Design a protein around this ligand. Structure first.
Ligand SMILES: CN1C(=O)c2ccccc2NC(=O)[C@@H]1Cc1ccccc1
Ligand SMILES: CN1C(=O)c2ccccc2NC(=O)[C@@H]1Cc1ccccc1
Ligand SMILES: O=C(O)CCC(=O)C(=O)O
Ligand SMILES: O=C(O)CCC(=O)C(=O)O
Ligand code: NI
Ligand code: NI
Lengths: 288, 288
């Protein structure tokens, strides 16, 4: 069976989205630099350590899906300078997203999360994303362009033995799922900073951690059209932090109005014909 | 041709959504009381008067669709006590919305707007709503349940001569639009407080104002699944105003997290497994 196509973030940029469109997955080598990965890891470290189980009794929105050996931390903008500056303004991310979502219009972050899998974490069942938050997606026609995509960025090594992600190539075009099996999968073997890019229709799963010693970490960035509601809110992020961001990063976090691709677009999150940012006196790129 | 079915808000409540599901439209008689209509009108009056043309050069999100004789005012919560208290907590509205959207989960306000049409306002072209903001909707399968609905509430009389809304009954099920004509329409003749309820697939239009003297006004409430982004933002509404509202009204305006209907729903607009309202210390029902 054919492996996941691998591409350069530096040279093959225009080829990334067409590759995913065809195969349902691609590995973007050095999507983030080792320096960005280092700072990201340092900044999120304590928040991963304090995170309780996904379905903790203290939560009003528990995640009953994820294993007890998974820790997921979202709303990263207030935690991580590297995320809010470097990741949210990534030239590579934005080229891919504009390639993917031009039919629909503006896109934003549905969820940016660090996931850490403890040693001996079991394999997830094969799945498509978005089914526990956006039931609407299952009612889209088969030829509808993908309305979200997921960048799974390695923040530590992804190996066969430590639970590297499985994907089924071509499964983004599957209508009948009688042939879903781990037999049909290939692995996303990745170094820190590499990214596995999949669509919301790509069948995939986290792999089994089999060493009992290694802790695998990733940054999952689900980017989606601004017509779909994010999984996470940035409504409680302090205004000083938001005002430190670029206008583009503000838009990605829902601190700006949005536009569809319709010729005479009337807009999303508008206030009597004016934008959020105009109405609220919203500054940008103001150092903290 | 058969007229738009008319129903009581008081007696026929359970029949309203099934009627719209079958015919694509229904008139809800006395949806709002004359007292609510009176207060609504009084409170929005000055904001309608100051509203510039839909595509005013001062706007960064101009509406190039609506006629120059249309005035539309959205984000009504800060303007109108009657809207934020009586309309947003309407028992009738909430029964209909929960009937309509149970397959998907929580619903919220995509836009609540007062529209005032000046004398001699021309008929709008026949259309479906949502095509200038949510291109995603056109890619839904034909049998997908409606993802938004629109309550067109008369705030003044709707007559044949003053431009009462036209609808084509059954047009919510049309795939081929070769037979779209004003010949196929019937009128929503309504007294103040009556509501025309349509789906996002119902073909309809504003009528021609032919008297040259009458000013027609309506309250349009587009309710949609919480998975779709609103046309309007309440992000700039003062916290005292938001904290005066019921928890249900807060949710409708995007000042709460949301849930899908998936068995083990993971939620929308969540903050690390917790809701907006829990995270932000959000009070409710605090008098202004
Ligand atoms: C449930 N679930 C998440 O929580 C998740 C986590 C990170 C990024 C995306 C994301 N979206 C999802 O739909 C997944 C789906 C899933 C996960 C494990 C096992 C079965 C299904
Ligand atoms: C453009 N447009 C609005 O502005 C509008 C106004 C009030 C409530 C819903 C709404 N949504 C829409 O999609 C309509 C569509 C339309 C209007 C006039 C002529 C052709 C098409
Ligand atoms: O652990 C992984 O590599 C995949 C995680 C995933 O697909 C998910 O949680 O949705
Ligand atoms: O004017 C009316 O009654 C209908 C208005 C309408 O359909 C619209 O603006 O979308
Ligand atoms: Ni997944
Ligand atoms: Ni309309």
């Amino acid at each position: 069976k054919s492996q996941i196509p691998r591409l350069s973030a530096i040279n093959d940029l225009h080829k990334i989205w067409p590759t995913v469109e065809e195969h349902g997955a691609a590995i973007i080598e050095s999507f983030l630099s080792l320096d960005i990965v280092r700072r990201l890891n340092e900044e999120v470290d304590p928040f991963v350590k304090i995170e309780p189980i996904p379905a903790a009794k203290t939560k009003d929105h528990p995640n009953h899906i994820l294993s007890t050996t998974t820790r997921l931390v979202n709303v990263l903008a207030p935690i991580s300078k590297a995320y809010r500056e470097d990741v949210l303004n990534s030239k590579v991310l934005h080229r891919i997203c504009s390639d993917a979502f031009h039919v629909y219009g503006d896109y934003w972050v549905l969820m940016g999360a660090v996931m850490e899998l403890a040693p001996s974490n079991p394999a997830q069942p094969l799945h498509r994303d978005m089914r526990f938050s956006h039931p609407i997606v299952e009612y889209l026609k088969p030829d509808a362009p993908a309305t979200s995509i997921n960048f799974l960025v390695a923040l530590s090594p992804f190996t066969a033995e430590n639970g590297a992600t499985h994907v089924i190539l071509g499964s983004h075009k599957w209508q009948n799922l009688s042939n879903v099996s781990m037999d049909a999968t290939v692995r996303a073997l990745m170094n820190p900073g590499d990214a596995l890019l999949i669509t919301d229709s790509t069948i995939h799963c986290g792999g089994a951690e089999t060493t009992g010693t290694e802790t695998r970490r990733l940054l999952t960035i689900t980017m989606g059209i601004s017509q779909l509601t994010p999984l996470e809110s940035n409504l409680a992020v302090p205004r000083p932090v938001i005002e430190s961001l670029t206008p583009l990063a503000q838009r990605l976090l829902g601190w700006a109005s949005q536009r569809s691709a319709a010729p005479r677009d009337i807009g999303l999150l508008t206030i009597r014909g004016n934008s959020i940012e105009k109405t609220m006196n919203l500054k940008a790129e103001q150092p903290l």
